Symmetry: C2
Subunit: 396 residues, 2 copies
Amino acid sequence: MGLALKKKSIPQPTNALKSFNWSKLPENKLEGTVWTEIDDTKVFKILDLEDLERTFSAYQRQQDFFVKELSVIDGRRAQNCNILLSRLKLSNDEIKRAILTMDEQEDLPKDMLEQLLKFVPEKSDIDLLEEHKHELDRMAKADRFLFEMSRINHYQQRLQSLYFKKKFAERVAEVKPKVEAIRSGSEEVFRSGALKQLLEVVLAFGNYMNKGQRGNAYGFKISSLNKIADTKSSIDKNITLLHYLITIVENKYPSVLNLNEELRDIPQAAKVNMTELDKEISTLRSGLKAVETELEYQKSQPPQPGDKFVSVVSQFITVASFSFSDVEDLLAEAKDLFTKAVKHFGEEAGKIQPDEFFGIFDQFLQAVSEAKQENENMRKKKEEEERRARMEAQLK
Amino acid sequence: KSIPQPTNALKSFNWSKLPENKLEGTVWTEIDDTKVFKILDLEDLERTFSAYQRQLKVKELSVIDGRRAQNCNILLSRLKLSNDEIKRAILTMDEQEDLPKDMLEQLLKFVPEKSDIDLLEEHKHELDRMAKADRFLFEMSRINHYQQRLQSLYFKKKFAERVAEVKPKVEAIRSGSEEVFRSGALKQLLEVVLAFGNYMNKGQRGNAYGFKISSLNKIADTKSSIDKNITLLHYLITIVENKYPSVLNLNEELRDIPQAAKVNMTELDKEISTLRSGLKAVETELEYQKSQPPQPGDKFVSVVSQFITVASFSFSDVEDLLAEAKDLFTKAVKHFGEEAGKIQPDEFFGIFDQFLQAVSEAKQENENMRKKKEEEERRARMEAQLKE
């Protein structure tokens, strides 16, 4: 609309040609751009149109597998589509039937649907392929497919829903343990006595130790935990403060022994990445909304033979919508308990994620584990060294 | 608050204390180290973690934690300078060029933090036989504004490099932006492409007045009918040359494009900031050091007053060219229909660079068949008659 775009002389091809496949610029977005100085009209007064037409005919010789043939779609898309079709091994008819039955015969695997979703007939294609409904007869395999599917109502959404349906158990399954691992982790850390008593003794150490103005501390960043081994003994450069804390704590604070047990879910919580997790959550949320929307639309259409969408989907959403309402419940719970634990140990508001937060304790729990072992080794090497001393003396 | 304090010095721990305020409603509310001291064999602990350590003969004094101490040893090993030498170097902004910029960078990672000075002061009497690492930190700590004097030195030694690898990137954008905007070879190439499309994919898929530049890299996707090897790009080239020769001058008027499709405006902006802030800090330390009584060997104000004038000049410039380059970019971006600030140079000019390739390699393939067909129009002769 508007006098500006007063284009005019459109010399168009007497016969069908192959298509270009550009991305047109809307009339509106055209102001103050190069296109204000470009007029394709000027070119036509010089172009050898007849040449062009025979050079890029829509009809061509039997472009053999991966007597004229009609091919409009560009070679790029055309090829990837044929590669897809070949792995798929289903006639257009079978495919159509499958997406209209939400694949009751289970002919469309998850990996394929994902692929199908990559080559859906866009607005442009339908328009370009319309001028040939009369001869879909011998119409390039690729070209034929895009049309056949484009003739299915809401094919895009029909697919996306079928894919989402197929990939819902998995997605929900892989999210529950993650959210639980944070729930469980947040709690354990919050109520472990072994951990609490551990910190108490460490604080004493640090206060008696680095005296001066470096002490008189009432608490320290949990990370400090992983710097305890940094302090080396003066008797033996291998006996680290952590080794010490461990030996004395075991002999004056036996309850601490149950540290790993009251922190059993720490490791499988140090791996959970809140960011990533939030994604998987949205994928499921938005995905659901899409399905519901498509279900509603579908419900407002007259029934049909073989179109078991509404049937199948209404059943899905029921089950799905419930199970997810659940995931989202536990999630908020878990996230709630996390920030609680976070603040509980001095860490700033929402500035640390579980993989790191729990990372901190997970690393310490290792450090502790291997030092506790290094400690036994020295306890044995010291005992054998003492049975020698005894007998070596006894003998002489 | 009952503070049982050690009779003798011990190794430090090196935790990260938590301020009293940020302690409410935390586990610390239920923890009292007092309860611990009532059962702790303090005598034992002291002996096990004495500041004085062997390493028969006098012992050594080491407070700094084993990890930090090692790191320092390592550094000092590669550095090979007496504490007196370094002291002197950073006091004279490295007059004798004894501090390479890669050491300066390492030195900056191990600067005496306050916790250290405080914990080391208790030993100023006996820095004599005081573990290497420990001696270093104390020694350096005794230099006024060490960390800043250091940081300034680094920044200074690393200013030409930085501004050097910055200027070209901005000019590459400045130039890139203008070249694209002015190329008549590009303007005319675009026009023809337009007509091709309008003629080609007819219907409602045409009557276009423009297209996304990116479309350029999709021309070759339209395959010929005669031969699946002759792509629409090849053809576009063939006929463009013989009806619009000015277009031959494309690579010529887009000379700066490949050397601009590389610039990442993001990263660029960081380099620019590290320069601005770092400069800010040197200026600040200057003013401070200027309000301090002079001293023999303290050539900071001297060396830096000089630097900043020179530097603040070389930069004020950078600042200006950048703004100019950013400006012309946004303009160029708008000129080709791209969305406001949703496209960066690496990608914007990427589009064109990709095109220029595809074009240069098609024009080539173009000549190959242009000769293989000439040979066959002459070589079907040496065989379509020698069979008579």
